[PDB]
Amino acid sequence: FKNIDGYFKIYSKHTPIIGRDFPQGFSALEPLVDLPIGINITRFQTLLA
Amino acid sequence: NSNKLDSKHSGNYDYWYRLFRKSKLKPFERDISTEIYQAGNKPCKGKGPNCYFPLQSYGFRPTYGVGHQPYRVVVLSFELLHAPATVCGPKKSTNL
Amino acid sequence: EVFNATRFASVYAWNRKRISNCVADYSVLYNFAPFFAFKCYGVSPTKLNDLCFTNVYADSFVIKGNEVSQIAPGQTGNIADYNYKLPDDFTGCVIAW
Ligand SMILES: *[C@@H]1O[C@H](CO)[C@@H](O)[C@H](O)[C@H]1NC(C)=O
Ligand SMILES: *[C@@H]1O[C@H](CO)[C@@H](O)[C@H](O)[C@H]1NC(C)=O
């Protein structure tokens, strides 16, 4: 995620990789949504289930 | 120039503008807040000496000078970059 | 000597002091008076120590409370019309304590 001049950009790629942890083989990321938030962001938090 | 809606008898002080901010504004960034400016070293919170309200009234009256008239300003931002566009003008559709 | 004076002239005869050949430090102004109206028009109260000027005039006069709000560019009243009129194109500051 990024917030240059607003325009929130979300990049993603879903694949069942080897599954130990962060892989070593290279993988690309395909942008999914690019939406102009145009606000101020300083802090970040994640939700659960 | 908009003096017919932004002016009335006995004045109108509804508008606002900021003169006291700790730092600069970055382009296209809003800083709506009411925090009293720090003067000297006092953590003072309030009005009076060395404790100034960040924004003062932009009061407008029907009888001001041209430089003091209630000018109405609207700006338009464009993005002339390589991306799927949304807004156009006249449109013809001659077949490819 | 302009803010430690004891006989600030009246508004009808406003004493005008020409300030020349000096370094304008505004901390001596900030520590000398617990201000109540330090509004500026051409510069910023914060931005004063980083700009260089040709000449400075300090007009000093003691006046009533509402007349403080009266004193401003493009104003009216018994003081703004007959005693002291601030030009609409004024590049400076007023200080009231
Ligand atoms: C955004 O937030 C940061 C920290 O909260 C602050 O320093 C900055 O001035 C803010 N910018 C705007 C445009 O609100
Ligand atoms: C005048 O100067 C003296 C000496 O620094 C100081 O103590 C006093 O507060 C000053 N008074 C005014 C009105 O500036």
Side-chain angles (χ1 to χ4, degrees):
Chain A
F1 326 113
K2 202 182 309 174
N3 217 54
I4 185 185
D5 90 337
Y7 253 123
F8 205 74
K9 309 144 275 303
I10 296 200
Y11 313 147
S12 99
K13 168 198 237 170
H14 300 225
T15 167
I17 324 166
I18 57 160
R20 317 169 201 157
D21 41 49
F22 55 89
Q24 285 61 60
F26 178 48
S27 276
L29 299 158
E30 171 262 356
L32 177 47
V33 307
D34 200 350
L35 60 169
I37 306 312
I39 76 153
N40 205 19
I41 314 174
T42 303
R43 309 157 211 193
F44 141 77
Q45 193 277 349
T46 83
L47 313 176
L48 271 299
Chain B
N1 204 236
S2 294
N3 323 330
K4 325 295 164 302
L5 200 182
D6 317 327
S7 72
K8 74 165 59 65
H9 290 291
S10 71
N12 193 4
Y13 308 151
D14 44 341
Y15 324 114
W16 292 110
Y17 80 120
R18 287 250 304 287
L19 320 91
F20 289 66
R21 194 181 125 71
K22 259 72 160 197
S23 305
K24 300 320 324 174
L25 317 192
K26 325 314 157 196
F28 294 150
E29 156 193 294
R30 334 214 315 148
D31 217 36
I32 178 176
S33 81
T34 69
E35 294 220 349
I36 270 69
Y37 208 106
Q38 193 197 15
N41 96 332
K42 217 166 302 179
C44 176
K45 212 46 198 184
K47 320 187 168 94
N50 282 287
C51 327
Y52 301 71
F53 214 72
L55 44 85
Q56 193 259 326
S57 163
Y58 218 80
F60 271 139
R61 286 205 69 119
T63 48
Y64 284 150
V66 158
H68 302 301
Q69 288 278 38
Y71 260 116
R72 199 156 270 188
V73 163
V74 305
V75 307
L76 281 294
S77 172
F78 285 110
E79 320 156 350
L80 327 186
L81 77 183
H82 312 287
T86 44
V87 282
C88 322
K91 174 259 177 179
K92 192 176 185 59
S93 207
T94 65
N95 210 2
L96 84 86
Chain C
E1 287 71 10
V2 201
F3 295 85
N4 222 308
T6 75
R7 202 79 179 154
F8 286 73
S10 302
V11 62
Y12 84 102
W14 45 281
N15 197 344
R16 163 157 266 172
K17 167 59 172 45
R18 216 183 175 203
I19 309 159
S20 315
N21 330 299
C22 68
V23 164
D25 70 278
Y26 299 77
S27 278
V28 75
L29 305 170
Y30 292 174
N31 88 305
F32 258 23
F35 327 102
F36 301 82
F38 178 47
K39 72 219 296 197
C40 295
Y41 326 103
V43 281
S44 171
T46 304
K47 308 304 166 55
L48 282 175
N49 306 295
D50 322 317
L51 307 82
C52 290
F53 325 98
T54 82
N55 243 17
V56 177
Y57 290 95
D59 314 340
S60 37
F61 41 86
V62 285
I63 210 158
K64 216 164 287 191
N66 182 34
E67 282 81 329
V68 168
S69 166
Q70 203 183 143
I71 299 152
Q75 284 288 292
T76 199
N78 271 355
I79 301 296
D81 287 290
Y82 316 133
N83 294 251
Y84 188 94
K85 175 135 154 49
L86 253 189
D88 62 339
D89 196 342
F90 176 47
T91 82
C93 299
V94 313
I95 285 136
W97 155 83

PDB file of all heavy atoms in Angstrom, chain A residues 40 42, chain B residues 21 29-31, ligand 1:
ATOM      1  N   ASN A  40      -4.835  12.216   4.950  1.00  0.00           N
ATOM      2  CA  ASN A  40      -3.574  12.078   5.668  1.00  0.00           C
ATOM      3  C   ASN A  40      -3.546  10.748   6.412  1.00  0.00           C
ATOM      4  O   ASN A  40      -4.498  10.411   7.123  1.00  0.00           O
ATOM      5  CB  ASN A  40      -3.395  13.236   6.648  1.00  0.00           C
ATOM      6  CG  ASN A  40      -1.943  13.520   6.967  1.00  0.00           C
ATOM      7  OD1 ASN A  40      -1.038  13.116   6.237  1.00  0.00           O
ATOM      8  ND2 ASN A  40      -1.717  14.225   8.066  1.00  0.00           N
ATOM      9  N   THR A  42      -0.952   8.318   8.904  1.00  0.00           N
ATOM     10  CA  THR A  42       0.259   8.236   9.714  1.00  0.00           C
ATOM     11  C   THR A  42       0.431   6.886  10.395  1.00  0.00           C
ATOM     12  O   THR A  42       1.562   6.414  10.535  1.00  0.00           O
ATOM     13  CB  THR A  42       0.257   9.360  10.769  1.00  0.00           C
ATOM     14  OG1 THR A  42       0.148  10.630  10.116  1.00  0.00           O
ATOM     15  CG2 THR A  42       1.536   9.334  11.593  1.00  0.00           C
TER      16      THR A  42
ATOM     17  N   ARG B  21       0.466  28.724  11.982  1.00  0.00           N
ATOM     18  CA  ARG B  21       0.755  27.301  11.891  1.00  0.00           C
ATOM     19  C   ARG B  21       2.236  27.059  12.141  1.00  0.00           C
ATOM     20  O   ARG B  21       3.087  27.879  11.784  1.00  0.00           O
ATOM     21  CB  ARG B  21       0.359  26.715  10.531  1.00  0.00           C
ATOM     22  CG  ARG B  21       0.333  25.195  10.525  1.00  0.00           C
ATOM     23  CD  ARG B  21      -0.035  24.642   9.168  1.00  0.00           C
ATOM     24  NE  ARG B  21       0.964  23.708   8.661  1.00  0.00           N
ATOM     25  CZ  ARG B  21       1.172  22.490   9.145  1.00  0.00           C
ATOM     26  NH1 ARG B  21       0.451  22.009  10.145  1.00  0.00           N
ATOM     27  NH2 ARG B  21       2.125  21.734   8.609  1.00  0.00           N
ATOM     28  N   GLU B  29      -3.139  19.554   0.875  1.00  0.00           N
ATOM     29  CA  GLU B  29      -3.211  18.940   2.195  1.00  0.00           C
ATOM     30  C   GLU B  29      -3.968  19.867   3.133  1.00  0.00           C
ATOM     31  O   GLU B  29      -3.580  21.025   3.313  1.00  0.00           O
ATOM     32  CB  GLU B  29      -1.809  18.642   2.741  1.00  0.00           C
ATOM     33  CG  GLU B  29      -1.716  18.550   4.257  1.00  0.00           C
ATOM     34  CD  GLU B  29      -0.281  18.574   4.745  1.00  0.00           C
ATOM     35  OE1 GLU B  29       0.464  17.614   4.454  1.00  0.00           O
ATOM     36  OE2 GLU B  29       0.105  19.555   5.416  1.00  0.00           O
ATOM     37  N   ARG B  30      -5.043  19.355   3.725  1.00  0.00           N
ATOM     38  CA  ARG B  30      -5.872  20.113   4.649  1.00  0.00           C
ATOM     39  C   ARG B  30      -5.355  19.955   6.073  1.00  0.00           C
ATOM     40  O   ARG B  30      -4.907  18.879   6.478  1.00  0.00           O
ATOM     41  CB  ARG B  30      -7.333  19.658   4.575  1.00  0.00           C
ATOM     42  CG  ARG B  30      -7.729  19.051   3.240  1.00  0.00           C
ATOM     43  CD  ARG B  30      -9.172  19.377   2.890  1.00  0.00           C
ATOM     44  NE  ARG B  30     -10.063  19.192   4.030  1.00  0.00           N
ATOM     45  CZ  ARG B  30     -11.159  19.905   4.248  1.00  0.00           C
ATOM     46  NH1 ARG B  30     -11.538  20.863   3.418  1.00  0.00           N
ATOM     47  NH2 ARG B  30     -11.895  19.649   5.325  1.00  0.00           N
ATOM     48  N   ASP B  31      -5.427  21.044   6.833  1.00  0.00           N
ATOM     49  CA  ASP B  31      -4.929  21.097   8.205  1.00  0.00           C
ATOM     50  C   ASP B  31      -5.968  21.729   9.120  1.00  0.00           C
ATOM     51  O   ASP B  31      -5.679  22.636   9.903  1.00  0.00           O
ATOM     52  CB  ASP B  31      -3.610  21.861   8.274  1.00  0.00           C
ATOM     53  CG  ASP B  31      -2.643  21.264   9.276  1.00  0.00           C
ATOM     54  OD1 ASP B  31      -2.608  20.022   9.405  1.00  0.00           O
ATOM     55  OD2 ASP B  31      -1.919  22.036   9.938  1.00  0.00           O
TER      56      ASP B  31
HETATM   57  C1  LIG D   1      -0.391  14.580   8.497  1.00  0.00           C
HETATM   58  O1  LIG D   1      -0.103  14.011   9.781  1.00  0.00           O
HETATM   59  C2  LIG D   1       1.231  14.271  10.245  1.00  0.00           C
HETATM   60  C3  LIG D   1       1.392  13.525  11.549  1.00  0.00           C
HETATM   61  O2  LIG D   1       0.133  13.233  12.140  1.00  0.00           O
HETATM   62  C4  LIG D   1       1.444  15.775  10.386  1.00  0.00           C
HETATM   63  O3  LIG D   1       2.787  16.024  10.786  1.00  0.00           O
HETATM   64  C5  LIG D   1       1.155  16.471   9.063  1.00  0.00           C
HETATM   65  O4  LIG D   1       1.244  17.882   9.224  1.00  0.00           O
HETATM   66  C6  LIG D   1      -0.238  16.101   8.561  1.00  0.00           C
HETATM   67  N1  LIG D   1      -0.493  16.709   7.264  1.00  0.00           N
HETATM   68  C7  LIG D   1      -1.700  17.143   6.884  1.00  0.00           C
HETATM   69  C8  LIG D   1      -1.781  17.746   5.512  1.00  0.00           C
HETATM   70  O5  LIG D   1      -2.682  17.053   7.613  1.00  0.00           O
END
